[PDB]
Amino acid sequence: GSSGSSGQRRGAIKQAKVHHVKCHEFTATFFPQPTFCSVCHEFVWGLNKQGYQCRQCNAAIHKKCIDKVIAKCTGSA
Ligand SMILES: [Zn+2]
Ligand SMILES: [Zn+2]
């Protein structure tokens, strides 16, 4: 005779954070389509190439084009 309990466990959180550069929340995102950069103005359709997309203006730019960002964010309603 015996018995046990399935047991309930949680913890599906690794890490959460956002980079604030020139009023832009760049978040590592993978663009499934070819998008032209806003700074260098180059086709961002590279295979296995993580880019950056703001949360407000939603501007797509290369990881290296993160420091070359001057334009300010306008924001969306
Ligand atoms: Zn922005
Ligand atoms: Zn770029």
Curated annotation (Swiss-Prot):
Calcium-independent, phospholipid- and diacylglycerol (DAG)-dependent serine/threonine-protein kinase that mediates non-redundant functions in T-cell receptor (TCR) signaling, including T-cells activation, proliferation, differentiation and survival, by mediating activation of multiple transcription factors such as NF-kappa-B, JUN, NFATC1 and NFATC2. In TCR-CD3/CD28-co-stimulated T-cells, is required for the activation of NF-kappa-B and JUN, which in turn are essential for IL2 production, and participates in the calcium-dependent NFATC1 and NFATC2 transactivation. This is Protein kinase C theta type. Part of a lipid raft complex composed at least of BCL10, CARD11, MALT1 and IKBKB. Interacts with GLRX3 (via N-terminus). Interacts with ECT2. Interacts with CCDC88A/GIV; the interaction leads to phosphorylation of CCDC88A and inhibition of its guanine nucleotide exchange factor activity. Interacts with PRKCH upstream open reading frame 2; the interaction leads to inhibition of kinase activity. Interacts with CD28. The lineage of its organism: Eukaryota, Metazoa, Chordata, Craniata, Vertebrata. It is found in: Cytoplasm; Cell membrane. The chain holds residues 144 to 213 of 706 of the full protein. The C1 domain, containing the phorbol ester/DAG-type region 1 (C1A) and 2 (C1B), is the diacylglycerol sensor and the C2 domain is a non-calcium binding domain. Expressed in skeletal muscle, T-cells, megakaryoblastic cells and platelets. A zinc finger (Phorbol-ester/DAG-type) spans 23-73. Changing residue 12 to E: Constitutively active form. Belongs to the protein kinase superfamily. AGC Ser/Thr protein kinase family. PKC subfamily.
